[PDB]
Structures are given as C-alpha cells and as structure tokens.
C-alpha cells in the first residue's frame, strides 16, 4: 500500500506513536516519508547481506529474521515478512522496541539527515486527527 500523509498520521496516532519516548507524531511521519516514500512494500537489499524492510526500512541484522542475514539478533522477535504488510502494526511495534533498546530516532538515517532540526509539524498540518 502507498499511504497518504494524513492517513498515515492517523494510523500512527491510533497505534500510540504521538509523543512516544518524547518524539512527536510529525517525526514519525517524516521518517516514513524519507525512508520509504510511504510504501509498505519497500525493500532495500544491501551488500553486507542484510535487507531493510517496509515503511520504516527496519534492518534484518538486528531487528527481524529473514534467514539469510549473517549475525542475526532478531530483537523484535518477528519474521521480516511481517514488516511488508498493508497493516502497519508490526512495523510500529518493532519501531517502539528499537527506541526501547536504547536508541533514539537517530537509528533511522533518513530521520537524522532529513527530519532532525526541521519543522516536523508540517507533516501533520491540515490533517484530521
């Protein structure tokens, strides 16, 4: 599924992301925009043997199991295919675990490079929330 911005914001709010660990909703929408362009089926296959999966481009070395990645930790305790669904619940649950395991949002390279220090409220402006 390719989400709209406001539709994704509403889904993320229903799943508890607004102000999760001090990160406002616009941060999460901005991260999804620049990681995947709002596409739930996005995959990026890296040269190190790992793959980034889904709307938040979660990596297979530490977070999910794809059976093909060296050094796998599977800290979200899920198959990586669960991150390619049209429903965002598995991606949101794993994103919460990434911040709970002592990372901030710096774990997402696109957040650090394209969202940090910007007006992230722009990403939710005008939406029905």
Q: Which of 11, 13, 24, 112 binds Cl ion (CB under 5 A)?
A: 24
CA 51/CA 48 separation, integer angstroms: 9
Give residue number: closest CB to Cl ion.
Answer: 25
CB of 18 to Cl ion, least distance (A): 5
Closest by alpha carbon to 125, among 28, 26, 30? 26
**Contact call for residue 12 and Cl ion (CB under 5 A):** no
In the numeric block, the tokens 């394209």 are attached to: 114
Q: Which of 25, 76, 80, 115 binds Cl ion (CB under 5 A)?
A: 25
Does residue 7 have an active-site annotation? no
CA-CA distances (angstroms) from residue 65 to 74, 83, 107? 5, 11, 18
Tokens representing 20 are 């999760």
Q: Is 101 annotated as a binding residue?
A: yes
**Residue owning tokens 């390619």:** 84
Residue 43 contacts Cl ion per CB under 5 A: no
Q: Does 6 bind Cl ion (CB under 5 A)?
A: no
Residues marked as binding for substrate? 101
**Site residues, Cl ion (CB under 5 A):** 18, 24-25
């Amino acid at each position: 599924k390719v989400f709209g911005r406001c539709e994704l914001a509403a889904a993320m709010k229903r799943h508890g992301l607004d102000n999760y660990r001090g990160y406002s909703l616009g941060n999460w929408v901005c991260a999804a925009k620049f990681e995947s362009n709002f596409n739930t089926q996005a995959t990026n296959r890296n040269t190190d043997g790992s793959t980034d999966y889904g709307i938040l481009q979660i990596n297979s070395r530490w977070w999910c199991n794809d059976g093909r990645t060296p050094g796998s930790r599977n800290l979200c305790n899920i198959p990586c295919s669960a991150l390619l669904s049209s429903d965002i619940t598995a991606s949101v649950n794993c994103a919460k675990k990434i911040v709970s395991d002592g990372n901030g949002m710096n774990a997402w390279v696109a957040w650090r490079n394209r969202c940090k220090g910007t007006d992230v409220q722009a990403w939710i402006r005008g939406c029905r929330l």
